[PDB]
Design a protein around this ligand. Structure first.
Ligand SMILES: CCCCCCCCCCCCCCCCCC(=O)OC[C@H](COP(=O)([O-])OCC(O)COP(=O)([O-])OC[C@@H](COC(=O)CCCCCCCCCCCCCCCCC)OC(=O)CCCCCCCCCCCCCCCCC)OC(=O)CCCCCCCCCCCCCCCCC
Ligand SMILES: CCCCCCCCCCCCCCCCCC(=O)OC[C@H](COP(=O)([O-])OCC[N+](C)(C)C)OC(=O)CCCCCCCCCCCCCCCCC
Ligand SMILES: CCCCCCCCCCCCCCCCCC(=O)OC[C@H](COP(=O)([O-])OCC[N+](C)(C)C)OC(=O)CCCCCCCCCCCCCCCCC
Ligand SMILES: CCCCCCCCCCCCCCCCCC(=O)OC[C@H](COP(=O)([O-])OCC[N+](C)(C)C)OC(=O)CCCCCCCCCCCCCCCCC
Ligand SMILES: CCCCCCCCCCCCCCCCCC(=O)OC[C@H](COP(=O)(O)OCCN)OC(=O)CCCCCCCCCCCCCCCCC
Ligand SMILES: CCCCCCCCCCCCCCCCCC(=O)OC[C@H](COP(=O)(O)OCCN)OC(=O)CCCCCCCCCCCCCCCCC
Ligand SMILES: CCCCCCCCCCCCCCCCCC(=O)OC[C@H](COP(=O)(O)OCCN)OC(=O)CCCCCCCCCCCCCCCCC
Ligand SMILES: CCCCCCCCCCCCCCCCCC(=O)OC[C@H](COP(=O)(O)OCCN)OC(=O)CCCCCCCCCCCCCCCCC
Ligand SMILES: CCCCCCCCCCCCCCCCCC(=O)OC[C@H](COP(=O)(O)OCCN)OC(=O)CCCCCCCCCCCCCCCCC
Ligand SMILES: CCCCCCCCCCC1=C(C)C(=O)C(OC)=C(OC)C1=O
Lengths: 314, 80, 94, 105, 169, 347, 96, 98, 110, 70
């Protein structure tokens, strides 16, 4: 019965990642004054199915890897960590209702850089390894502002419990007291997922260009699971919805609409901006977001004390 | 000192906002009338069992019942 | 006291400094079209060597065997986003 | 050279984490609070040479609180003899050691 | 079996160290230490060390071993009997320890060790509306003032020291 | 290096040693050793050559191994005592591991194998810090755990340090390796009397730091790292030959000098405890240290090795080097034996 | 808004903690009778098991003190089934 | 004593003997050193949780932080050796024999 | 226990999809390929700057590890000391950032 | 036009709606028509194990009220 709950979590994750690709191609079509896919299915609804069947019977590139074992373990780790970030998500009830769900998510997203690192070293190209090291350095850079923005917000929560974050936002959204944290958080989640304007794995060859089309589709679907997940986590964190404990589907519809609009905001940002040069997003992290994030971390430490609004522990 | 402020606010407004927010976070808890209430609320929160006292015969400020008048009250927290 | 084991030990340098005993070269190939030989020093570009001729089609030797009307449509295909301007330049020349 | 700066200045730099019986957050007791309090109050001030021989009993009770070697050895003896008598067929467990009795509260 | 699970994780933990103490390459060595960090974290988590376990993930694995793998990736150009023999040696020594302490319910390598499951030595009470480990870590800011001073000074000195010795001038 | 950064890093070295000296918790002991190593690594890499990087790598590996064994001894003390007071240890295994860790941090034999390399790899001032200041914290921890130190272990470390530091310096021509093997032999002398009377341990440490600081200050004031460049000192500055003469005769323990003061007192505290063979063999082995000191005095003061012609240019310039406390340390390392009963200030 | 709502949440936390405090003497009496029940059961089964073993004192304390020691997990659940052992020693750690 | 403590001590000794028997790489030595640190973290953590000694729960984090800072310093030393010889082989660190 | 079931299910689904992605086109018998990089055969050039940003991550991540018990630390009754040490840790992270800034450590990956 | 993208958004939104609705209904099915008991702290687990013992049927969610006393 619990395994039914695990499958009703993880199989709709795979379906929503399948159709996020279609939604991205359609929304980027209409924002680029064209259509998206509308031939393959009715309104293109069979485009992800056709494309998945195409990729799973495409020939393997059959490369020379330094490690066979890390070449197998990098997609396994990417998919496993992409699926374990969902299990504490309170929507309105988490699958695993853990007391440190925020810190668990922060740790399991910190572990996601080994997929990039192991897949880069598993490729024998030195250029793929250099691009992998640039992607890892970008990601661990933006993890700093993830951790500190998240800490500064949870100073208003009182605990690392994700389910308490619904109770925190019953009177107001937490984007009202923490909109600078919210906007730096949103750009930091944009830079965690190698998402445009921070997609330097498509700027002129990434880390996973040496895989077959099947494992490349697995990396791709882990990345889009991370995108949908970080939008849901941002929605829980700043745009927390109303919850009737006798009608949980009201909260589910509300956070689902907000998370869809936030994922479409990711799609709409990649359809609007040029890329950063690599040192420019290093400049954006280390010289712009991190001083503001430390200043607001001091502010959200000292502000519940000066207003007498320290939240409860329990 | 006023030309320096407009100059750095034109060149580097991220750092001006950073040092302004940091300076407010430093000085403002020592200027607020509510900083006393943070301490008062944290010591009013009963994580532990209030272990009773053996009544020797002379403790007029320790109650015999929770609904007795003597003892610490939290009407300041109910009102605020 | 030098033995057979310590018979190859030379003294250390007087300033205790031993001699240290490069920069990246990237061939951005054709994979319009353009070949680039970058000499990079990290992020910085030290040398950029553009190798061209990947669309050298011998146009102006082919002009030498064709009449003026016949050699007009080669100019459509040189600056192939600026067709009638090159037509105009050749027309004004003739 | 233990330059005892903390007692000279009267500051508490690290005495608070030094023993389990010290002041704890929310008055959480250690699992061997009483044994360590007894061993310290026995051994206090009399010096370490006299403390090793005049306070050995409280130190043995406190080490046996910490590591539970005698308790684990006794449970090993009882459980080993119990499974030996199960193997010999001479013992049977009660219903309250099999899970058939609807526990107390 | 499930009453012995922490012990079982510890066995994998020791096997994980024989993964990288045999030193096949620093990259497989890093992988073995990552798997060892995960299973030792699981050992910590199964006593109630939730915050300390997620520090093993976030700071040891997600913070530090990332930098180990990153530095290793910028060396050891990408393309033994000693590693194989030392690995099977450590494997056999650990499973002989397992066999001895499971058939005897006592062993003595350097100290005496019980052979029962380590569930026996726990406490039979509650902590109320807090985690004791959480409140003891939260008292770093109330009781651990000198510890915060020396730790932050060591980290600031660490930043300065890394920028000195990596400069080369 | 930036002078402000140099001052902050040297105050951090001092702060690490102070936190070892003044703290009552084993975690703060380990923290003080970590802070000391972390700050002293750039002092060793001051000049940025491959020899200083090799020396700092070897120093890092040995001190990191010692710090991990120290923390394992601390953690075993927490097992068998449940507390953290910096006092005697409550397990002989923790006592053995902490004695091994501190013997590594002092570089006592047979963990001596980093001391002559690292001292050769670093400049003379950082070698002075390594051979004087980096002894104070582990000798303080040994001073506080001597109710639990095993006798046979610390005496084996002591005699092995004295013999290996005796035979090591007999083959040397580099002055930094000579001072390093002298360091090993003197640490053997300091820990041989630790369980008998730690006041004489403190005496030997202070007299050793005075004599070592005198010799490194002379080596810096003359810019000399080899024997053969120290042999040009009589043609450059004839006073420095007399100073290295009296200080090398003092480090050999020849009376009436001050370096006769510790070892004599050490014998004076080892025969009260009915050990006769042990201080006798220690004092006989100290003749080896005396022998390579006499080799240096023959090369420097008592004969005149031939110089070069360019020395005539160096006659036209006086030494502008800040010879800090060099007359004070020269006096306090030679003429101090009539004040031998001052040692009660260390009780 | 967070000022008003966190102050109300602190009042709600104090109300929950006072409910806990009012329930704690009943829970403490039940827990005391619970652990003495389990120790007396273990003592009687120890008496009926450890008869053949030479020199065995039943109920022999391993402490020289006569002070009440808080019972260990293996002292209470050592003779019982492993299902009750798991559901008394890993359940809160494993609960969701 | 407890059976898990045997395995954590034996893991510390395995990582010790790995750190005390080099093969070629300095990075493998740094990994053995951090395996030693990890085993110390685990053992200290299991004791402090087992004893309910509340204030020492901040102790392993400190034991993490300092030593990870130490690890950072070690990595820098490796890089400087790797900036001298191209590799991190410990047999290139033999200039101080003479 | 439910967490171990969930982790095992996620790992099993990931390993299953990886095995399917690695062995479903292996059933095809396409052809054997011979196929005889911007760098030609040159060794990987070390860049000091990537290592500096990785170590700067590690050091600020240790400072983050110190900062993580603050939502629980605000519940103390020694609030003046807690607030002083909290602002002091964030200030030392800021001073580490400023020293990394002003000594050109954040340059060409700024 | 722009409402051509709404079928894919509807499919993805139903797929995001499914896990929360599923875990709410599975928690109410597995816990007596009510929410799953949240035991973050050992007092909550203590009361929950007390409920499992006082229910008699080894299920904490079987509640016993005034009818279980005289
Ligand atoms: C207590 C322990 C004391 C340990 C020593 C403390 C000083 C050394 C540490 C700092 C250091 O290097 O300072 C330089 C150091 C001298 O070392 P130097 O560089 O080799 O000096 C050579 C010439 O002085 C260079 O000449 P100059 O032209 O550059 O400057 C002349 C200078 C000018 O002097 C001044 O400017 C002094 C006024 C400034 C002081 C502060 C005023 C405010 O004159 C002097 O300093 C005369 C020498 C004074 C004696 C130095 C040694 C002091 C005694 C050491 C302990 C002896 C223990 C014996 C025990 C025996 C039995 C066991 O000290 C001074 O300059 C001032 C000494 C003041 C002594 C006061 C003693 C009591 C204090 C209470
Ligand atoms: C979570 C829900 C959504 C959240 C909001 C996000 C939705 C909108 C997203 C739009 C698309 C963004 C795409 C990526 C863009 C990346 C580039 C970018 O924006 O860089 C950030 C830029 C970077 O600066 P820059 O690069 O533009 O400027 C040049 C910088 N120098 C000078 C250093 C060369 O700005 C910031 O970093 C600002 C971040 C937020 C700051 C919030 C400040 C709040 C107010 C403080 C106080 C001010 C008043 C004075 C004091 C008063 C005291 C009482
Ligand atoms: C869940 C997401 C989607 C999952 C994946 C999509 C579902 C369908 C997966 C199976 C697709 C069909 C089989 C693989 C593709 C066949 C294409 C091909 O190259 O065929 C020729 C290949 C090879 O035939 P061949 O001998 O002509 O080889 C061609 C190459 N030469 C001639 C040069 C040697 O045929 C096969 O591999 C047949 C294997 C069995 C076919 C399937 C059996 C039933 C499976 C159910
Ligand atoms: C530079 C250091 C700046 C901060 C100094 C301490 C500030 C503070 O709040 O101290 C009070 C705090 C706590 O004082 P307190 O008044 O909260 O103490 C009450 C006792 N407890 C916490 C157990 C309930 O620290 C101290 O009093 C002693 C530790 C710090 C001593 C000064 C260190 C200087 C280091 C120089 C090098
Ligand atoms: C949570 C909900 C998630 C929902 C996800 C999916 C959303 C979109 C679903 C699909 C919508 C309808 C698509 C219809 C496609 C067209 C099918 C068709 O008619 O194919 C015709 C083809 C040839 O037919 P023929 O007879 O030759 O035609 C000549 C006629 N004179 O004949 C054939 O090709 C053979 C028949 C093929 C039929 C395929 C139909 C679509 C299959 C979709 C599978 C997944 C559906 C969702 C599953 C979960 C919910 C149940
Ligand atoms: C190359 C290898 C393969 C790579 C791919 C697969 C591995 C990577 C992806 C999976 C990562 C596994 C993470 C396991 C632990 C996660 C942390 C954790 O347990 O947090 C949740 C929770 C803490 O919160 P709290 O509510 O306080 O605890 C319950 C108390 N009421 O704590 C709990 O609820 C405690 C539950 C019981 C303890 C669970 C222990 C799990 C088993 C040990 C780790 C196994 C994995 C080892 C490898 C990890 C990665 C290297
Ligand atoms: C006291 C409260 C606590 C304070 C500490 C914590 C603050 C939180 C934020 C931490 C920031 C850490 C890094 C700060 C480094 C500052 C030095 C600096 O960056 O100088 C260089 C810069 C010129 O830039 P450049 O060198 O070219 O770098 C590339 C970007 N152009 O030069 C500049 O851009 C000049 C910037 C300096 C002047 C800023 C003035 C701001 C005034 C705000 C209102 C008053 C605030 C009062 C607080 C104290 C101010 C000193
Ligand atoms: C129970 C006991 C408890 C503890 C008691 C106290 C113990 C004190 C131990 C002191 C150890 C001192 C170590 C050396 C000083 C530390 C800093 C240092 O090394 O400074 C040298 C300095 C560096 O300058 P730099 O430019 O780098 O030199 C190279 C030239 N290009 O400058 C130079 O190189 C210039 C040359 C002269 C430097 C000599 C400095 C000597 C100072 C110490 C004197 C001896 C100790 C005090 C007396 C005994 C006390 C016990
Ligand atoms: C005595 C104390 C240790 C007891 C256990 C010994 C385990 C087996 C190792 C024996 C030595 C085997 C060997 O070849 O050692 C040398 C090797 C490093 O040498 P390498 O550079 O690889 O090859 C050139 C050969 N000198 O050395 C190594 O690779 C040694 C790696 C040791 C890792 C320990 C693993 C656990 C062993 C059991 C517990 C202790
Ligand atoms: C378990 C398998 C589920 C289906 C596979 C993932 C969903 C299909 C995504 C297909 C896809 C699309 C549309 C796509 O556009 C794309 O290019 C950017 C991909 O990466 C290679 C893709 O993988």
């Amino acid at each position: 019965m619990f395994m039914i709950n695990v499958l009703t979590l993880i199989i709709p994750i795979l379906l929503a990642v399948a159709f996020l690709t279609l939604v991205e191609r359609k929304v980027l079509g209409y924002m680029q004054f064209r259509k998206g896919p509308n031939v393959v299915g009715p309104y293109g609804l069979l485009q992800p199915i056709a494309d998945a069947i195409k990729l799973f019977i495409k020939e393997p590139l059959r490369p020379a890897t330094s490690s066979i074992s890390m070449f197998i373990l990098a997609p396994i780790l990417a998919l496993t960590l992409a699926l374990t970030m969902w299990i504490p998500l309170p929507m309105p009830y988490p699958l695993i209702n853990m007391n440190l769900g925020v810190l668990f998510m922060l740790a399991m997203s910190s572990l996601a850089v080994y997929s990039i690192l192991w897949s880069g070293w598993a490729s024998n190209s030195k250029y793929a390894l250099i691009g992998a090291l640039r992607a890892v350095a970008q990601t661990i850079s933006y993890e700093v502002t993830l951790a500190i923005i998240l800490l500064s917000v949870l100073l208003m929560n009182g605990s690392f419990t994700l389910s308490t974050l619904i109770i925190t936002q019953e009177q107001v959204w937490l984007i009202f007291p923490a909109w600078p944290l919210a906007m730096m958080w949103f750009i930091s989640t944009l830079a965690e997922t190698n998402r445009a304007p921070f997609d330097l794995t498509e700027g002129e060859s990434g880390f996973n260009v040496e895989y077959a089309a099947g494992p490349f589709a697995l990396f791709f679907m882990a990345e889009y699971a991370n995108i949908i997940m970080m939008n849901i986590f941002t929605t829980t964190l700043f745009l927390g919805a109303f919850h009737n404990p006798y009608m949980p589907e009201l909260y589910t519809i509300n956070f689902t609409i907000k998370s869809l609009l936030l994922s479409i905001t990711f799609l709409w940002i990649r359809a609007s901006y040029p890329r950063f040069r690599y040192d420019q997003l290093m400049h954006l992290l280390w010289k712009n977001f991190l001083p503001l994030t430390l200043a607001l971390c001091m502010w959200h430490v000292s502000l519940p004390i000066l207003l007498s609004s320290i939240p409860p522990q329990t | 000192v006023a030309a320096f402020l407009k100059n750095v606010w034109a060149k580097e407004p991220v750092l001006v906002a950073s040092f302004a927010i940091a300076g407010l976070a430093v000085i403002l808890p020592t200027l607020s009338p509510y900083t006393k209430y943070s301490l008062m609320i944290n010591r009013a929160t009963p994580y532990n069992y209030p272990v009773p006292l053996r009544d020797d015969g002379n403790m007029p400020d320790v109650p015999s019942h929770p609904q007795d008048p003597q003892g610490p009250s939290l009407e300041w927290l109910k009102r605020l | 006291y030098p033995t057979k084991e310590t018979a190859h030990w030379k003294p250390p340098p007087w300033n205790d400094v031993d001699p240290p005993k490069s920069n990246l070269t990237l061939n951005f190939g054709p994979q319009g079209v353009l070949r680039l030989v970058m000499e990079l020093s990290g992020e910085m570009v030290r040398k950029c060597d553009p190798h061209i001729g990947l669309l050298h089609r011998g146009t102006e030797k082919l002009i030498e065997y064709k009449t003026y009307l016949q050699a007009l449509p080669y100019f459509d295909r040189l600056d192939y986003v600026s067709m009638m301007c090159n037509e105009q330049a050749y027309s004004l020349a003739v | 050279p233990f330059f005892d700066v903390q007692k000279k200045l009267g500051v508490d730099l690290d005495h608070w984490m030094t023993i389990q019986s010290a002041e704890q957050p929310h008055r959480i007791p250690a699992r061997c609070h009483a044994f360590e309090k007894e061993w310290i109050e026995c051994a206090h001030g009399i010096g370490s040479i006299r403390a090793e021989k005049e306070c050995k009993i409280e130190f043995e009770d406190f080490r046996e609180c910490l590591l539970r070697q005698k308790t684990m050895k006794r449970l090993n003896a009882i459980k080993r003899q119990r499974d030996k008598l199960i193997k010999e067929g001479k013992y049977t467990p009660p219903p309250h050691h099999s899970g058939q009795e609807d526990l107390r509260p | 079996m499930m009453t012995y699970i922490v012990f079982i994780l510890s066995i994998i933990f020791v096997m994980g160290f024989v993964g990288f103490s045999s030193k096949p390459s620093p990259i497989y060595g890093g992988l073995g230490l990552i798997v060892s960090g995960g299973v030792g974290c699981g050992i910590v988590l199964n006593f109630g060390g939730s915050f300390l376990g997620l520090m093993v993930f976030l700071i040891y694995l997600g913070g530090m071993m990332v930098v180990f793998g990153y530095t290793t990736a910028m060396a050891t150009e990408q393309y033994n009997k000693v590693v194989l023999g030392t690995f099977i040696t450590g494997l056999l020594m650990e499973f002989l320890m397992v066999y001895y302490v499971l058939k005897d319910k006592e062993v003595e390598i350097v100290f005496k060790f019980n052979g029962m499951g380590d569930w026996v030595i726990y406490d039979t009470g509650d902590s109320g509306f807090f985690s004791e480990e959480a409140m003891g870590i939260a008292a770093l800011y109330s009781y651990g003032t000198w510890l915060v001073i020396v730790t932050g000074w060591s980290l600031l000195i660490g930043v300065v020291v890394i920028m000195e010795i990596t400069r080369g001038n | 290096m930036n002078p402000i950064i140099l001052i902050i890093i040297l105050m951090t070295v001092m702060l690490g040693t102070i936190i070892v000296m003044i703290s009552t918790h084993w975690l703060l002991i380990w923290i003080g050793f970590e802070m000391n190593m972390l700050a002293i690594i750039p002092i060793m890499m001051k000049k940025h050559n491959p020899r200083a990087t090799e020396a700092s790598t070897k120093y890092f590996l040995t001190q990191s191994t010692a710090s991990m064994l120290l923390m394992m001894a601390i953690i075993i003390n927490l097992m068998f005592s449940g507390q953290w007071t910096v006092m005697k240890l409550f397990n002989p295994m923790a006592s053995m591991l902490m004695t091994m860790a501190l013997a590594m941090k002092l570089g006592m034999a047979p963990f001596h194998f980093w001391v002559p390399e690292v001292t050769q790899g670093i400049p003379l001032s950082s070698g002075l810090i390594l051979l004087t200041w980096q002894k104070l914290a582990p000798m303080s921890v040994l001073y506080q755990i001597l109710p639990s130190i095993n006798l046979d272990l610390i005496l084996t470390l002591s005699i092995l340090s004295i013999t290996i530091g005796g035979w090591g310096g007999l083959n040397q021509t580099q002055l930094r390796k000579i001072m390093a093997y002298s360091s090993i032999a003197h640490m053997g002398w300091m820990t041989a009397v630790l369980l008998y009377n730690p006041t004489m341990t403190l005496l030997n440490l202070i007299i050793y730091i005075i004599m070592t600081s005198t010799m490194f200050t002379l080596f810096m004031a003359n810019s000399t790292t080899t024997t053969l460049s120290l042999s040009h000192t009589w043609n450059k500055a004839p006073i420095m030959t007399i100073l290295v003469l009296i200080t090398l005769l003092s480090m050999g323990g020849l009376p009436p000098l001050s370096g006769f003061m510790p070892k004599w007192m050490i014998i004076q505290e080892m025969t009260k405890n009915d050990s006769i063979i042990l201080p006798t063999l220690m004092a006989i082995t100290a003749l080896l240290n005396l022998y390579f000191y006499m080799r240096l005095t023959y090369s420097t003061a008592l004969t005149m090795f031939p110089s070069t012609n360019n020395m005539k240019m160096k006659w036209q310039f006086p030494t502008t080097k800040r010879m800090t406390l060099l007359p004070t340390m020269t006096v306090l390392s030679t003429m101090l034996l009539p004040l031998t009963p001052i040692l009660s200030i260390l009780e | 808004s967070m000022m008003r709502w966190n102050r109300e949440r602190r009042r709600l936390q104090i109300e929950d903690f006072e409910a806990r405090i009012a329930l704690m003497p009943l829970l403490q009496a039940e827990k005391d009778r619970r652990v003495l029940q389990m120790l007396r059961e273990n003592l009687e089964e120890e008496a009926t098991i450890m008869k053949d073993v030479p020199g065995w004192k039943v109920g022999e304390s391993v402490f020289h003190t006569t002070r009440w020691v808080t019972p260990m997990m293996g002292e209470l659940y050592g003779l019982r089934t492993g299902e009750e052992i798991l559901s008394s020693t890993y359940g809160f750690i494993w609960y969701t | 004593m407890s059976l898990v403590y045997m395995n954590i001590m034996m893991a510390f000794t395995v990582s010790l003997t790995g750190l005390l028997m080099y093969r070629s790489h300095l990075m493998s030595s740094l990994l053995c050193l951090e395996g030693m640190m990890l085993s110390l973290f685990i053992l200290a953590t299991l004791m402090i949780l087992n004893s309910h000694f509340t204030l020492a729960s901040m102790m392993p984090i400190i034991l993490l932080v300092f030593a990870a800072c130490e690890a950072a310093l070690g990595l820098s030393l490796l890089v400087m050796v790797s900036n001298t010889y191209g590799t991190d082989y410990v047999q290139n660190l033999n200039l101080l024999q003479c | 226990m439910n967490l171990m079931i969930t982790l095992l299910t996620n790992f099993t689904l990931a390993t299953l999809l990886v095995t399917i992605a690695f062995w479903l086109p292996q059933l095809n018998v396409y052809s054997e390929k011979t196929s005889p990089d911007p760098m030609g055969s040159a060794r990987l050039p070390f860049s000091m700057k990537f290592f500096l940003v990785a170590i700067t991550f590690l050091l600020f991540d240790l400072e983050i590890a110190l900062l993580l018990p603050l939502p629980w630390a605000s519940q103390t009754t020694n609030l003046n000391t807690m607030l002083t040490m909290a602002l002091l840790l964030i200030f030392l992270l800021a001073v580490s950032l400023a020293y990394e800034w002003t000594q050109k450590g954040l340059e060409w990956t700024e | 036009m722009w409402f051509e993208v709404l079928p894919g958004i509807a499919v993805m939104g139903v797929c995001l709606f499914i896990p929360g609705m599923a875990t709410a209904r599975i928690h109410r099915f597995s816990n007596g028509g009510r929410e799953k008991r949240v035991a973050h702290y050992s007092y909550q687990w203590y009361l929950m194990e007390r409920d499992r013992r006082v229910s008699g049927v080894n299920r904490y969610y079987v509640s016993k009220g005034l009818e279980n006393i005289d």
